[PDB]
Amino acid sequence: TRKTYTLTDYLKNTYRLKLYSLRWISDHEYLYKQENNILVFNAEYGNSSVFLENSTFDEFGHSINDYSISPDGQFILLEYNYVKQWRHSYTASYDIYDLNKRQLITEERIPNNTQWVTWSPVGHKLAYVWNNDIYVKIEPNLPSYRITWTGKEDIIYNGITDWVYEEEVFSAYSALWWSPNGTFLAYAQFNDTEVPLIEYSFYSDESLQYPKTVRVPYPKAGAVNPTVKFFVVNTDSLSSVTNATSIQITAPASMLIGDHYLCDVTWATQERISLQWLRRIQNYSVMDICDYDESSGRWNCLVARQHIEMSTTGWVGRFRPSEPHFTLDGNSFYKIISNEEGYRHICYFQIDKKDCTFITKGTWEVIGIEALTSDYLYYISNEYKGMPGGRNLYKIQLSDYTKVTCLSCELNPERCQYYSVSFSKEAKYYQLRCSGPGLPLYTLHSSVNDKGLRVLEDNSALDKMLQNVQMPSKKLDFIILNETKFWYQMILPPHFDKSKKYPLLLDVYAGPCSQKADTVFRLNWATYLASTENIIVASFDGRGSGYQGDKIMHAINRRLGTFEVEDQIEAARQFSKMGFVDNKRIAIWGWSYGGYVTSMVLGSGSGVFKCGIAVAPVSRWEYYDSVYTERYMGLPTPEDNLDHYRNSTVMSRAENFKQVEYLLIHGTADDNVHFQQSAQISKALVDVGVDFQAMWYTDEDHGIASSTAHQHIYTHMSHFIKQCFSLP
Amino acid sequence: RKTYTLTDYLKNTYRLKLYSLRWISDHEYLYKQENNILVFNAEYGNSSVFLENSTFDEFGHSINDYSISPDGQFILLEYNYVKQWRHSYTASYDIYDLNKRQLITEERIPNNTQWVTWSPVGHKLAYVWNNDIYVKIEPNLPSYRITWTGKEDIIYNGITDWVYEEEVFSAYSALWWSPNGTFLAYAQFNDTEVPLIEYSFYSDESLQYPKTVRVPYPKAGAVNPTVKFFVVNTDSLSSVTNATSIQITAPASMLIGDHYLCDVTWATQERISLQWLRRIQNYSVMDICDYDESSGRWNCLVARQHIEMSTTGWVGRFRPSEPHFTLDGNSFYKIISNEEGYRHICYFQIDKKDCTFITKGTWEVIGIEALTSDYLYYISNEYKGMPGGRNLYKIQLSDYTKVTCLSCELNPERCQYYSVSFSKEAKYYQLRCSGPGLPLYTLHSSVNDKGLRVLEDNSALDKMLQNVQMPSKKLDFIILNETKFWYQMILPPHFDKSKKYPLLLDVYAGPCSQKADTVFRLNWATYLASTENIIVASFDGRGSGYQGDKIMHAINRRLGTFEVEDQIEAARQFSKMGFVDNKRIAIWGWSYGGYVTSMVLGSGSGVFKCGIAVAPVSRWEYYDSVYTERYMGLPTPEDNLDHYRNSTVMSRAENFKQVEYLLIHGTADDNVHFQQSAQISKALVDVGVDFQAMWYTDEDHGIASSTAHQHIYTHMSHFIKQCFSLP
Ligand SMILES: *[C@@H]1O[C@H](CO)[C@@H](O[C@@H]2O[C@H](CO)[C@@H](O)[C@H](O)[C@H]2NC(C)=O)[C@H](O)[C@H]1NC(C)=O
Ligand SMILES: *[C@@H]1O[C@H](CO)[C@@H](O[C@@H]2O[C@H](CO)[C@@H](O)[C@H](O)[C@H]2NC(C)=O)[C@H](O)[C@H]1NC(C)=O
Ligand SMILES: *[C@@H]1O[C@H](CO)[C@@H](O[C@@H]2O[C@H](CO)[C@@H](O)[C@H](O)[C@H]2NC(C)=O)[C@H](O)[C@H]1NC(C)=O
Ligand SMILES: *[C@@H]1O[C@H](CO)[C@@H](O[C@@H]2O[C@H](CO)[C@@H](O)[C@H](O)[C@H]2NC(C)=O)[C@H](O)[C@H]1NC(C)=O
Ligand SMILES: *[C@@H]1O[C@H](CO)[C@@H](O[C@@H]2O[C@H](CO)[C@@H](O)[C@H](O)[C@H]2NC(C)=O)[C@H](O)[C@H]1NC(C)=O
Ligand SMILES: CS(=O)(=O)n1cc2c(n1)CN([C@H]1CO[C@H](c3cc(F)c(F)cc3F)[C@@H](N)C1)C2
Ligand SMILES: CS(=O)(=O)n1cc2c(n1)CN([C@H]1CO[C@H](c3cc(F)c(F)cc3F)[C@@H](N)C1)C2
Ligand SMILES: *[C@@H]1O[C@H](CO)[C@@H](O)[C@H](O)[C@H]1NC(C)=O
Ligand SMILES: *[C@@H]1O[C@H](CO)[C@@H](O)[C@H](O)[C@H]1NC(C)=O
């Protein structure tokens, strides 16, 4: 009688989740945007004042994309003319507004096409990157000091990452790191001179007569990589008369012997910086701890303060070596590392001692360190109820490691099993964000006695809307394979009847350290397929999946396209044996790494799947970027792992596609998984005489996220699944 | 009896036999029988082995093709064949001395040679390598370099650039030997400021980074290549260190603006004719130039300059027609549009501006095939007033009233579409009948127009087809606005006019096209009619060829209008005939046909349920300058920009919500760029229209590789069958 959650509801965002995105400005206040007005809230009492009125920039003459208030609250950086580049990179125009004199600064403006801008962490200094060079402004109205002069489009990047460092190393375009009080500005320089370019057509508006060719320095597996250098500049001794001196910090000898990466930069104190370097064979990393020397004006990294992190079973870290969390004096730090059982736990290190002490342990993992005080370390883990797909906040007493308190486990155990946290400047307060299994819940807490101060947002408006919809349910459980539990989830249709046989769609990702079985609440395409179309949408975390230790995660080391593909087939075989699944109607789909796995599964000859959809799939590891691919596969050389690079392609399985219905989709402007990857799959299928369905998306990238393309792709895939399952 | 299936079509089960001969003289031809090259005596039919099947067993390479020198002393062997555009390719070549029975190992033709040609007499060679011309007087002797300006993608000497190859010459070659081989004439193209089309080429899966293919290609209204013309005396090569290439400049009427060199024809040993065309292609000038032995220059008397212009459209069918000179080179015959708009043969004196028409009537001359001192032979569609038929005629030069049809009555039931191949001095001729019955190849003597013998009658295929339920073909016309418009229908076997059949409209409809004819075909339509019981129809509406300029020039400056409307009207007319299921009318086309299909599907007519566009044009500004501007003029506000903008597929995207559409394009299409379909898909996505798509990796405009050909027709067959609810 009630309506179902339809494809139009998903595509038009009829049922919206409310958020509570705050920005901490001190240890007791935060900023929050309400009705376009920026308000300041007192954490203790919940009272607010207007920080900046929505009408302030009514005559600005530009649509403001974002804002950034200086740490001292005197200025506001206004971002406009936003032009997206890659996953994290973009260019924009900036204006600075003085909040005390209520005026826009008109002198010495930040230029247009600025690549990155950041306030110092204290006060109101600015550092920005323009034309691949770094500039520093001590005062917003004063002229800029040019820090670097070597910046060259597609070749020398100062203070910004190139394509592969942005995507695969830093998850950011910025390569600038201010010291804690803003004295020093540390930065990396990337050199892409001999990195080969990926080239692809961009069609643009119909008015463009000749297509443009986009050229991006992108190292594919085994190719020449960018090189890196690291520098530190004193921003307190800058001169208008003389050019700035940047002090270089060279990589340790164990890195300089061959290809390597800079993988982490973390300031320890006002005069101490730590850097982590990673070998191109990503199973060996080195942390250097460097001290400023006032007499020489140099940075010295003592060999007695060097820390090695290596792996004998795989690579180092989940995606990269983890960041250290230094104490106030910078003499020691806490870092998540894989223990002797292969589980990621917090280790406590002294800067000048080799052995660290694990402060946590068990067959579960620490996800992240969130805050550190002299008495407590706060962290997120999946310890609770032994559910790897759940997340809770804990605190550990630093004077007694046996004293671990869960801070979020029992707040609302039925509604909330997946949390993230935001602490105030000195951890006096924390905002907890519960993202499932129930509707998201945002709450504010004080650290002294872990008081639950108030509910910030409980999504009660959405809860009221959803009571009139026949919503699907979610089952999270496990199957046992070779004495190991592997978790899965199922999005079950409303009024689920275990005596009936439902078609099943296997939603796959299965990349290394992936997790597709979790307690998160989502309103997505699967919600529609289950609610309206009565399809079970299942996901499974097999070998190679994360947050369950290295025995599972490292099982696919040097062997992508093996165990993680076999385990999805095994999960479907097991689900197909369940009484509520129609074994004549099992489908599989995935995007990105999931598109590769879907294609490898469809080409396996298992006979389990009737049909499948691969969106922007990888097809051959030699076509993907060096940093990600080599982390798991090593090098594609006869002396390393070339035979497995050649055995793990989708193209080699083309003949096995004769038994399935396949839909292959890819954006023509995908800078990440190049269109080439799907162009080679289609050519191999054509060569063996296999019919299949295809769809290209003109000028769409890896996300196929423009409003019209997003609606079109999900509409096209819904027709395909429905046709496959004989659904009118 | 079995039907003609999709696998019969894709696997070439029912093969048409051909009879490809090569005339070597006035009475002998070469023919390949069991990989042996045989020489046949045309008069008696007796043969001998010219070159044994085993001669090149130990060559070390597969021989793609060969060419015998005109004097029969040498054979040019072509291998390492690498295809480029429609006509161009590169190859390696060896020369084999037929007398000495040995391969020439000294001063070999270089690898990556772009073009090679024997002189018309003897055994001189001219070849193009790295965009420069070279001449070898003797096959084993060093070459003489002719040009030093050749430069990849910039300067082309003796070879055409992309647009001249595709749209002007229909050939890669831009070299023309004089009749006895004394002179070598050539064109030089300069693409310096011509913009490049760029597209990815993925190659074998072993290629880690895709290649970017970059080709100088002028799109409509862009900067065009410029051209120069030269003549070199090859007999002076062994006497001078560096023989002068004498330039022949274009006339003043062409030099005032952008222009093209559109025809080169030698008249005598010392007289050459050149045709030039203005960028606005309704004005052409022919210059007739004589060698001046005293100065070593070429002079073109203004008294011998001929103007060909058009007030209703462009000049020529696709370009101005070539002249056929009398032996003394003082007069010539040329096909031109008469006062009534019908293409007929006109006879010109080289220094007189008014010509005399030698043929007339409401039909057209297709081509001049041979000219002797007493007769001119030509092909026309006069017979029975059928524009889709072709026959060979002979006209007495001393009396124009004496016109004999040589082929009309040979087998009128079986043969209504002929082409011909004459021996070197027209002593014999091979007739090639290509429909409506099975192709038939016959040999004839010109002395008495007598049939000598049947060369190939396709009796083996005839025997095979007797066991197959073959479709039939109807060729007829409908009267619209007091004008006859021809159509053809491929009808299912056992066609019953009381039954309602699904109909597929097979469209091309470009300017001067002809899709209704008498040719016998074994193709996709054969399978659709024979196995799936679908009527496959084609219609020749406004803009179609071979029926006069009133029909052909109707779409002048207005592509995407009458030729699109007339296809919609044809489907309504076929529905009126009573044997068509109006709920099951589909449309499909390739190239210009894909543009027309898309325009029809976006018209909002309601006539068509579904349609397939393969490699369509979507916007005339994306297509090349020479072809597009011939019909559309320039895309400027002063000329025809409003119509260029009004005739795109993209502007009709909203109307595609009413149909099922399949869009298909090869990614390495150098001709209709993938861009054209990339813009269609983007416009459909933008208005929220669901449709089907298929790209073909590394396939060009022909989607002709064996595997892609089989894949595309299989994919299209599934789509049409689903549209027509066929199991
Ligand atoms: C960026 O890297 C390139 C090398 O990839 C550097 O160029 C080399 O410079 C040295 C001299 O310092 C020459 O001997 C090499 O031949 C150069 N190689 C090439 C390929 O140019 C370049 O100097 C680096 N730039 C910066 C600013 O670090
Ligand atoms: C930020 O930290 C820096 C580094 O410790 C401070 O700079 C030092 O300040 C002391 C005291 O004035 C001097 O004796 C040192 O010579 C300074 N060192 C350098 C490298 O400049 C700086 O004063 C601090 N700034 C703020 C705002 O607290
Ligand atoms: C880091 O990576 C590779 C993983 O294969 C190890 O490389 C050694 O060299 C080749 C592989 O290229 C093999 O023949 C050796 O047997 C590998 N060594 C071992 C011990 O397996 C390398 O040793 C690994 N490093 C660490 C710290 O485990
Ligand atoms: C091909 O055409 C270009 C012009 O498009 C000619 O290049 C010019 O040559 C003159 C004389 O050397 C220079 O002064 C100009 O600067 C050149 N222009 C450009 C755009 O490069 C070129 O010489 C022509 N080539 C031939 C062989 O005719
Ligand atoms: C091919 O034709 C050319 C051009 O008419 C002939 O060359 C001329 O021959 C006469 C003698 O009959 C000479 O007086 C001229 O000086 C030649 N002209 C040139 C431009 O070379 C040539 O002899 C003919 N070749 C053959 C084999 O008959
Ligand atoms: C927890 S973290 O902040 O250290 N972290 C998480 C991720 C990363 N870092 C890196 N990110 C990866 C996600 O899959 C991406 C990805 C993987 C593919 F196999 C692919 F085909 C396309 C594709 F985009 C990777 N390029 C980056 C996931
Ligand atoms: C009789 S003739 O020898 O003078 N002659 C016939 C043709 C030509 N010359 C030129 N040729 C044309 C065929 O359609 C082609 C063609 C037309 C299109 F509209 C198109 F989208 C793609 C495409 F390849 C033209 N580029 C050339 C057809
Ligand atoms: C909140 O209330 C306190 C006490 O009344 C006051 O001092 C403070 O300024 C208020 N905070 C804000 C952000 O308005
Ligand atoms: C940014 O661009 C605008 C428009 O071109 C220009 O007026 C303005 O001066 C530019 N800003 C800076 C800081 O260069």
Ligand SMILES: *[C@@H]1O[C@H](CO)[C@@H](O)[C@H](O)[C@H]1NC(C)=O
């Ligand atoms: C700073 O360095 C740049 C580049 O080397 C140079 O052009 C400029 O003149 C220098 N300025 C001073 C003050 O030396």
Ligand SMILES: *[C@@H]1O[C@H](CO)[C@@H](O)[C@H](O)[C@H]1NC(C)=O
């Ligand atoms: C054909 O026959 C004639 C007369 O017998 C003979 O001289 C000639 O060599 C033959 N031709 C061929 C090509 O065998």
Ligand SMILES: *[C@@H]1O[C@H](CO)[C@@H](O)[C@H](O)[C@H]1NC(C)=O
């Ligand atoms: C020569 O050609 C082929 C081998 O390529 C062979 O079948 C044939 O029998 C040979 N002999 C003759 C007389 O054709």
Ligand SMILES: *[C@@H]1O[C@H](CO)[C@@H](O)[C@H](O)[C@H]1NC(C)=O
């Ligand atoms: C053509 O290439 C092959 C292989 O590189 C070489 O052996 C041969 O000599 C070349 N031919 C000529 C004429 O240079």
Ligand SMILES: *[C@@H]1O[C@H](CO)[C@@H](O)[C@H](O)[C@H]1NC(C)=O
């Ligand atoms: C031959 O003459 C032409 C025209 O003057 C000249 O461009 C070329 O360089 C010359 N070649 C030589 C001297 O080898």
Ligand SMILES: *[C@@H]1O[C@H](CO)[C@@H](O)[C@H](O)[C@H]1NC(C)=O
């Ligand atoms: C050629 O066409 C243009 C555009 O239609 C026209 O202005 C011009 O008069 C025509 N020229 C001739 C010679 O008819």
Ligand code: NA
């Ligand atoms: Na409370």
